[PDB]
Amino acid sequence: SLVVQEQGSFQHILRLLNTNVDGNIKIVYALTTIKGVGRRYSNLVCKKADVDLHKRAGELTQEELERIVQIMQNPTHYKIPAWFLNRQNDITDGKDYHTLANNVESKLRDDLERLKKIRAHRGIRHFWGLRVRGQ
Amino acid sequence: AVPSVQTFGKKKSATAVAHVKAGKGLIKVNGSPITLVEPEILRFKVYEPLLLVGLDKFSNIDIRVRVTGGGHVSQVYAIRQAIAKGLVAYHQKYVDEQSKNELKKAFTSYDRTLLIADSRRPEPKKF
Amino acid sequence: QCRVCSSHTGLIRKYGLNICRQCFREKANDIGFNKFR
Amino acid sequence: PGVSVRDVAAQDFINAYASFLQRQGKLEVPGYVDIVKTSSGNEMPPQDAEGWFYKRAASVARHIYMRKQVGVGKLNKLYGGAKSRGVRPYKHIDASGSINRKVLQALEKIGIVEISPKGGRRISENGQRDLDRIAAQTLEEDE
Amino acid sequence: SYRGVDLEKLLEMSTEDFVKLAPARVRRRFARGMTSKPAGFMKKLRAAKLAAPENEKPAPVRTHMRNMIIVPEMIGSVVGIYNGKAFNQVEIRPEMLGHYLGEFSITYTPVRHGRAGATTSRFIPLK
Amino acid sequence: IKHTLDIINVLTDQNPIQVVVDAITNTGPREDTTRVGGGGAARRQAVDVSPLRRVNQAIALLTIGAREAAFRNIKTIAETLAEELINAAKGSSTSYAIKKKDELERVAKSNR
Amino acid sequence: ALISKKRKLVADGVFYAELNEFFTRELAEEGYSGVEVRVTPTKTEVIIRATRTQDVLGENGRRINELTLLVQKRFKYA
Amino acid sequence: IIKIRITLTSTKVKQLENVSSNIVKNAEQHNLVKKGPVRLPTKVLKISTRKTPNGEGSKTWETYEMRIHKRYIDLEAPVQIVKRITQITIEPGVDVEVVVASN
RNA sequence: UAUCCACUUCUUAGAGGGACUAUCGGUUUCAAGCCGAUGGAAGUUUGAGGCAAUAACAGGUCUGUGAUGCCCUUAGACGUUCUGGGCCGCACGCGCGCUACACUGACGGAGCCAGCGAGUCUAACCUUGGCCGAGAGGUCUUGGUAAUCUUGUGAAACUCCGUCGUGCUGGGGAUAGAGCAUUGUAAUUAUUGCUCUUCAACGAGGAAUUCCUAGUAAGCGCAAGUCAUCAGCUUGCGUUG
Ligand SMILES: [Zn+2]
């Protein structure tokens, strides 16, 4: 197509949702750097918001960043349905959510200590394995 | 009753039947023309029986090509063998003999396999 | 199972036949399976 | 000396009727075109996210002209999704059914495909007229 | 909680409404059918539940199937589950719902490998 | 091959097939060496290759040089093989084929 | 009944082989040479080609009905 | 007036050829309309067998083979002629099938 | 799947042909033979296995027979059942394989080519077609008891057009969690399939080692058996070569 180059106004290392992203690769694969968001979820999140994905992430504006962040916590209102999410039909509250980069570890630790206080075979197998190969 | 000539062409479990009729002068292979063959580099392999004798001999003949079996490249050898065999069979039956002699010398000067199929049949498993 | 020699091993279960192979290798010609190639 | 799709190439024909569907726009587009993947045997969404649907419609119209009639399983093996199954190798996986269903139903709703009496989806006379017309200016783009 | 639902209302509905709030495995397990002996199991379970002293643990109900889905009419009950050799006296708490009973009943002592003294001493005698 | 031959069209070269046959000629192994037994301490014997085998590892050495020049770099097989084939059409010693050719030649000269 | 065609012919060959081996081992002392069977729409007919036939049909067909019941009970026939 | 399709299956080709030649020469000799013996391809049935029933040596294989031939001849005849030919033609090795309907 | 006619050029069932190392030239007591060239569909014994007679096997059982040697004749379960667990548990060694370490490539669209097969009764196999569902699949019908329908198995590798640029990357996909479906009476030590997420080692591999001379190695998928569900197990087939 057509080459469009701008004098400056691109940032090398950015930061969004308290997580660092880099502004030279495309938007989707800059959003694979954050944990809990992969390729396809970032494609769906960006292609809902009418974001051109052929261009790169260095020329992202703040109004695109705020609407991506606004997509993140409640995707269910904007036709991102249930089967794309990580938290689906949870045992705690019964609703659906997409867990974030500082919340995947809380989910994993919550599952493991829940298996501990349940005293299931999965939990005692995993903590015995961790306490034996750790030592 | 149109004058028609039907001659086969085979390579590697793929046989092409070439029905060489008389008409306005036209080439189609499975309802697709010779300028659109599914491999685009073997297009010249299908073009090779045309170039080897002459472009003016095809003004009066329509050639109907249908192929089955094999893969892609074996079908290309089958349709070019069928085209060369049907061309020399039409120039044997209706056109005079010496013209067909010049076609078959022109074919065997470049490609011996255009008139005789492959002698490289798949081997037994040797149990 | 194999109804010739009480064979519980080496069964072939094709065509509802359930003969063991060590009894099939001598009764093939009486059934009709002949060695050709 | 008649003009048809059987004298044009594939890629320019699909590009031309995709452009004519984009410029005309008299089809049915639901809300999950920007959501769905083309098959279970795919892993990434299509790159032309605003125009792969009309590419699919051009493809299915071109396959309904070239034979008597097709079904949904014929379209599913026609796409031919191949999975990288993690550690497990590639196989042949049939495509998504509802993609074929919605491009077909949106194409009888405009009047190119009709349901054959033999159970499949056959080409109509209006569709033959339309595809032969766009084949005529397909020849009249390379004059 | 189970689906964001407070526990004291969850104690008093029937099994079909648990299926309506269940994951897919529990609904597929319910959708085919049971045998008749868990009815006697729940009969003797509630018989041991009704003889419980107040503010204490009830009578143990020695269980043996390792494949049953937990259905919470036995909240507060304590059960001893067969592993194949012995019994594990496990009390039911309302946070273990949606689970099989056999995951509370291990099948083996674990594979020890960090013991070089016992391994070296037990080799076959070479004399 | 057709993209490579299109590149040697636009390598300021009018005769790319002549570049192919002249690089085949210039990367002919003229003298080789063999592995004679010799009683443990095996010396090397001066021995000359047949012309069929000469064009065999001439073709093979050109292709493996283009392959390892085409490994782990952005530059394609056509451009690496065109550079390999124009650096072997004349003796330049910037190519892998000429380098292994005069390496085996000085091995054959040093083992007589 | 209603066996697929290759399975029908192979199971028919097993039926010939089993009656051949059963009549080889049973009437070895009555001159056993071979058998042939004819399949009619009404019933199935077994032709015993044994070269000492007076010992095959005993008193009031007793061994004939005995071998008939040996075919009947093992091979699941009406 | 009934149309009868007779299909013959046999593993041996000599007895099948004798049966088919007898059927054709019996049908032509008393003026019935018919088709010729239509020749289906020979099914080759192959199965794989080990060369090692016992576990000694390397693993190598052989193949057992079968040949099955199929013919079918279409006839038009009255009922008594069909019944007497069906009574006559029963031979070991060749299977004779009688089809009444034409749908 | 009959509107009629012709044919088997291709498909196929056959009868015959043809090859007998034919001819030539070297080599050889110039004797049977061997090698090179021409012709030939086939000219290494054109390529492959079964079959005998013979001497040797304490090899295996036949639920075969002979007042046969051994130990008790039975509170032993070597007979029956009922449930629950396994055989897959993991510092590890050895071996057979799969996937990769990438740009002759990963991803997205389009082109699209096979053959060996197989398939249901007193049951429920192969499944066409239509609706629903992102998919997994479900559902409603229909065809085939088979060269007829699945099926032209429109398979994959491949072909083109666009995305990616050498950055453990968008290569790789181990591990793990959540949800939805299917088979099974029963799926937890997760049967299997789908969606999202997690993106672990691993920058062409040492000592050594396996297989192979033409439609052959290698890559690639498909079919048949194990089959209730899945293959990375085995045998074949076909594509490129
Ligand atoms: Zn047996």
Side-chain angles (χ1 to χ4, degrees):
Chain A
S1 178
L2 310 164
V3 62
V4 180
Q5 298 296 320
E6 183 178 1
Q7 189 157 23
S9 185
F10 317 119
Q11 290 86 17
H12 301 285
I13 301 298
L14 282 165
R15 179 197 171 198
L16 195 70
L17 216 57
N18 298 318
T19 48
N20 293 318
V21 298
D22 179 342
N24 55 356
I25 194 66
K26 308 292 174 181
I27 297 90
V28 193
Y29 308 99
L31 280 162
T32 57
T33 311
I34 69 171
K35 184 178 184 293
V37 173
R39 305 189 209 151
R40 157 73 151 150
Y41 179 74
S42 170
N43 292 116
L44 190 58
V45 159
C46 294
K47 87 169 72 71
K48 180 255 158 187
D50 304 330
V51 175
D52 185 77
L53 291 177
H54 296 285
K55 62 94 175 180
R56 290 179 162 185
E59 65 273 15
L60 287 173
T61 61
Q62 183 62 255
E63 54 90 18
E64 303 292 327
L65 294 174
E66 290 291 325
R67 70 166 48 84
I68 288 305
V69 159
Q70 188 274 331
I71 284 165
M72 297 305 219
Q73 68 290 29
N74 189 359
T76 65
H77 187 273
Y78 293 99
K79 207 66 188 298
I80 301 102
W83 63 91
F84 292 109
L85 312 173
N86 299 5
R87 298 294 299 272
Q88 191 49 59
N89 287 340
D90 51 353
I91 212 71
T92 82
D93 187 74
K95 59 156 279 304
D96 46 350
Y97 182 76
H98 198 89
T99 186
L100 57 88
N102 267 333
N103 207 6
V104 293
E105 301 190 9
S106 73
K107 161 71 169 313
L108 286 173
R109 292 318 165 148
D110 186 74
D111 290 9
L112 268 297
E113 62 86 20
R114 174 201 45 83
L115 283 171
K116 168 68 215 82
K117 56 96 174 179
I118 279 168
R119 308 222 176 190
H121 169 82
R122 261 185 157 181
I124 61 175
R125 182 186 165 188
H126 282 314
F127 292 109
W128 184 81
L130 285 182
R131 85 181 82 177
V132 160
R133 329 311 160 203
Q135 286 157 3
Chain B
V2 60
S4 177
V5 159
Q6 312 191 27
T7 315
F8 88 110
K10 188 255 160 184
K11 153 79 175 183
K12 210 183 168 186
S13 85
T15 313
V17 186
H19 315 99
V20 185
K21 293 183 181 291
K24 210 177 186 182
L26 183 144
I27 314 295
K28 298 292 283 294
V29 172
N30 277 332
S32 159
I34 191 166
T35 181
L36 310 157
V37 178
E38 297 178 26
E40 82 281 341
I41 312 298
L42 294 174
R43 200 101 53 84
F44 300 101
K45 282 298 286 185
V46 193
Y47 278 145
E48 270 168 6
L50 294 174
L51 60 86
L52 205 48
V53 168
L55 73 165
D56 51 347
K57 308 293 178 66
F58 293 96
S59 297
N60 73 309
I61 46 174
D62 299 4
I63 295 91
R64 300 318 222 176
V65 170
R66 298 190 173 190
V67 65
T68 184
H72 291 344
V73 190
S74 169
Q75 285 186 347
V76 166
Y77 298 129
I79 64 165
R80 70 189 290 273
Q81 183 187 176
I83 279 170
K85 266 196 189 175
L87 181 69
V88 302
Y90 201 99
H91 283 274
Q92 157 72 90
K93 183 65 177 69
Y94 295 143
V95 191
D96 64 306
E97 177 75 25
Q98 194 41 252
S99 61
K100 188 263 290 180
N101 287 127
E102 294 294 323
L103 281 71
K104 65 94 174 181
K105 298 288 94 175
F107 286 163
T108 188
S109 299
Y110 167 67
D111 207 347
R112 188 231 66 89
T113 62
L114 265 174
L115 270 299
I116 295 95
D118 214 317
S119 66
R120 272 209 300 155
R121 64 179 176 88
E123 284 180 343
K125 63 191 73 67
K126 202 174 178 175
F127 64 97
Chain C
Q1 299 294 324
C2 167
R3 79 286 189 276
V4 179
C5 69
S6 285
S7 191
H8 193 193
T9 300
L11 282 182
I12 182 67
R13 223 173 65 191
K14 304 204 211 160
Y15 301 139
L17 197 42
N18 57 52
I19 315 296
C20 69
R21 42 180 202 101
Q22 287 105 348
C23 289
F24 178 70
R25 283 202 200 222
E26 87 269 8
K27 303 292 183 174
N29 302 118
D30 204 346
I31 289 175
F33 288 101
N34 297 89
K35 170 60 74 195
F36 291 165
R37 194 33 57 207
Chain D
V3 65
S4 57
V5 68
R6 262 67 160 267
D7 312 321
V8 307
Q11 284 83 17
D12 48 359
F13 184 77
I14 301 299
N15 285 312
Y17 182 75
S19 64
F20 278 127
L21 281 188
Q22 272 146 358
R23 290 159 198 182
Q24 282 153 3
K26 46 176 188 292
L27 280 185
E28 298 290 325
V29 174
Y32 74 106
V33 186
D34 288 342
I35 297 169
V36 74
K37 214 167 294 294
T38 46
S39 73
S40 62
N42 293 116
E43 54 269 13
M44 271 315 109
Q47 293 164 168
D48 50 355
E50 69 275 16
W52 66 271
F53 184 78
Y54 292 164
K55 277 265 192 210
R56 183 62 75 192
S59 181
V60 65
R62 189 266 186 190
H63 294 285
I64 293 167
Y65 204 108
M66 61 79 71
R67 188 72 274 171
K68 281 81 69 177
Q69 62 258 4
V70 298
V72 189
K74 320 285 172 166
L75 294 174
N76 284 327
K77 65 169 178 47
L78 187 153
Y79 176 62
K83 280 174 181 287
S84 185
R85 325 213 318 279
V87 65
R88 291 298 92 214
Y90 282 20
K91 295 291 179 68
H92 187 217
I93 297 89
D94 285 329
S96 52
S98 70
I99 284 301
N100 310 318
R101 306 323 280 264
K102 84 168 154 179
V103 299
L104 277 181
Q105 282 147 0
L107 184 63
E108 292 85 5
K109 207 179 308 184
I110 190 66
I112 296 89
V113 68
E114 294 296 324
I115 300 182
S116 72
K118 268 79 61 184
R121 263 67 177 256
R122 68 172 294 275
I123 182 68
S124 74
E125 317 305 315
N126 189 359
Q128 284 169 73
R129 167 84 269 184
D130 208 312
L131 294 179
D132 289 19
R133 273 187 293 111
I134 65 170
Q137 69 273 15
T138 300
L139 269 71
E140 294 293 328
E141 282 290 327
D142 62 286
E143 80 270 19
Chain E
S1 56
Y2 185 72
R3 292 302 149 191
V5 189
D6 190 359
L7 279 299
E8 292 83 3
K9 75 153 281 293
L10 279 153
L11 191 152
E12 282 95 3
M13 72 290 290
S14 71
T15 312
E16 191 56 79
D17 291 331
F18 295 120
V19 169
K20 295 298 183 292
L21 271 72
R25 170 74 265 171
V26 185
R27 303 188 186 193
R28 203 190 193 277
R29 166 77 181 273
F30 179 74
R32 212 171 291 264
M34 321 315 148
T35 183
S36 296
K37 62 93 175 180
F41 263 87
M42 61 79 71
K43 169 56 64 182
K44 66 186 175 71
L45 182 63
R46 67 198 185 177
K49 267 195 153 193
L50 61 84
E54 288 88 6
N55 300 353
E56 281 173 5
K57 270 192 176 182
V61 187
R62 198 169 81 176
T63 61
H64 275 65
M65 73 291 291
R66 279 171 49 121
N67 66 317
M68 61 80 71
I69 183 56
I70 174 166
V71 59
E73 70 268 14
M74 59 205 157
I75 297 299
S77 164
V78 59
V79 298
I81 174 63
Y82 199 45
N83 54 6
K85 201 182 171 194
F87 306 106
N88 313 310
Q89 194 66 226
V90 179
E91 51 92 18
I92 295 92
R93 271 176 283 104
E95 55 264 17
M96 64 184 73
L97 277 296
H99 199 196
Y100 288 161
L101 183 62
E103 285 283 291
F104 297 98
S105 195
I106 47 169
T107 49
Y108 57 94
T109 58
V111 189
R112 52 104 171 171
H113 67 275
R115 199 175 198 159
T119 301
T120 316
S121 57
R122 76 149 184 130
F123 297 146
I124 61 170
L126 265 286
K127 65 177 72 175
Chain F
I1 295 298
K2 74 167 69 67
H3 274 316
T4 317
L5 185 62
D6 282 320
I7 287 156
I8 312 164
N9 286 351
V10 66
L11 278 175
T12 63
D13 181 69
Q14 311 165 348
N15 55 5
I17 317 169
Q18 281 202 12
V19 168
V20 175
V21 71
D22 286 336
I24 284 307
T25 308
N26 287 334
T27 57
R30 300 179 296 170
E31 287 194 349
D32 298 342
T33 185
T34 184
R35 186 83 274 156
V36 67
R43 75 278 191 189
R44 286 98 188 172
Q45 192 263 325
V47 64
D48 301 336
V49 76
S50 66
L52 194 52
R53 206 165 167 276
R54 173 184 57 182
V55 65
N56 284 354
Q57 70 273 15
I59 289 177
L61 183 63
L62 282 160
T63 58
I64 62 170
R67 206 153 295 106
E68 70 185 2
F71 190 38
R72 296 214 210 163
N73 67 325
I74 297 92
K75 187 188 283 293
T76 61
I77 298 90
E79 305 183 357
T80 54
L81 188 153
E83 180 258 331
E84 171 56 284
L85 183 63
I86 200 66
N87 278 330
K90 63 93 176 179
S92 177
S93 286
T94 58
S95 66
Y96 182 76
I98 293 290
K99 270 190 200 65
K100 295 293 185 289
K101 185 261 291 181
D102 62 357
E103 268 189 0
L104 61 83
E105 284 305 314
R106 68 175 275 276
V107 167
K109 293 328 218 174
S110 171
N111 292 332
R112 64 189 183 182
Chain G
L2 192 151
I3 318 292
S4 192
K5 57 175 74 67
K6 51 200 179 220
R7 195 169 63 244
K8 153 173 66 45
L9 295 184
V10 175
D12 204 5
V14 174
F15 181 75
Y16 292 107
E18 193 162 2
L19 276 296
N20 195 8
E21 291 293 323
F22 173 61
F23 289 146
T24 313
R25 298 280 86 80
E26 176 68 35
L27 72 164
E29 294 289 326
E30 289 82 3
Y32 176 70
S33 57
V35 285
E36 49 178 356
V37 298
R38 278 287 283 276
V39 177
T40 60
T42 310
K43 61 188 178 69
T44 315
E45 297 178 353
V46 176
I47 295 95
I48 319 163
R49 301 151 69 247
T51 73
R52 187 75 185 96
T53 302
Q54 171 61 31
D55 307 352
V56 185
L57 73 165
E59 290 90 6
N60 190 359
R62 175 194 173 176
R63 296 194 211 169
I64 286 296
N65 288 122
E66 166 182 351
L67 277 177
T68 302
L69 286 166
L70 291 174
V71 174
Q72 270 290 123
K73 294 314 160 188
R74 188 264 181 274
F75 293 101
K76 191 179 183 293
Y77 277 105
Chain H
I1 309 297
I2 187 167
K3 34 189 174 293
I4 293 298
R5 179 187 212 184
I6 312 168
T7 302
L8 312 162
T9 79
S10 185
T11 61
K12 44 185 75 178
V13 69
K14 290 305 167 189
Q15 267 64 59
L16 184 62
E17 203 271 316
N18 295 336
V19 159
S20 188
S21 62
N22 176 45
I23 285 298
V24 162
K25 291 166 193 176
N26 186 253
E28 204 171 346
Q29 77 189 17
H30 71 287
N31 203 6
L32 297 180
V33 293
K34 77 183 176 201
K35 291 179 181 293
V38 176
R39 297 150 162 94
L40 297 189
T42 288
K43 163 62 184 192
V44 294
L45 193 139
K46 62 178 72 66
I47 48 169
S48 296
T49 311
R50 272 82 60 198
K51 291 216 198 171
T52 59
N54 301 130
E56 298 157 21
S58 65
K59 308 299 176 183
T60 174
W61 297 76
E62 75 271 15
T63 305
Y64 283 80
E65 279 193 2
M66 280 334 297
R67 263 188 200 161
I68 298 104
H69 320 285
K70 285 216 172 200
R71 318 280 97 87
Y72 65 95
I73 314 182
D74 293 86
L75 276 298
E76 194 267 329
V79 188
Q80 194 265 330
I81 295 301
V82 165
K83 185 66 173 65
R84 77 156 195 89
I85 296 169
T86 311
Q87 277 193 187
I88 278 177
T89 193
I90 300 173
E91 292 283 330
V94 185
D95 189 359
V96 190
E97 283 199 13
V98 172
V99 183
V100 167
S102 57
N103 223 331

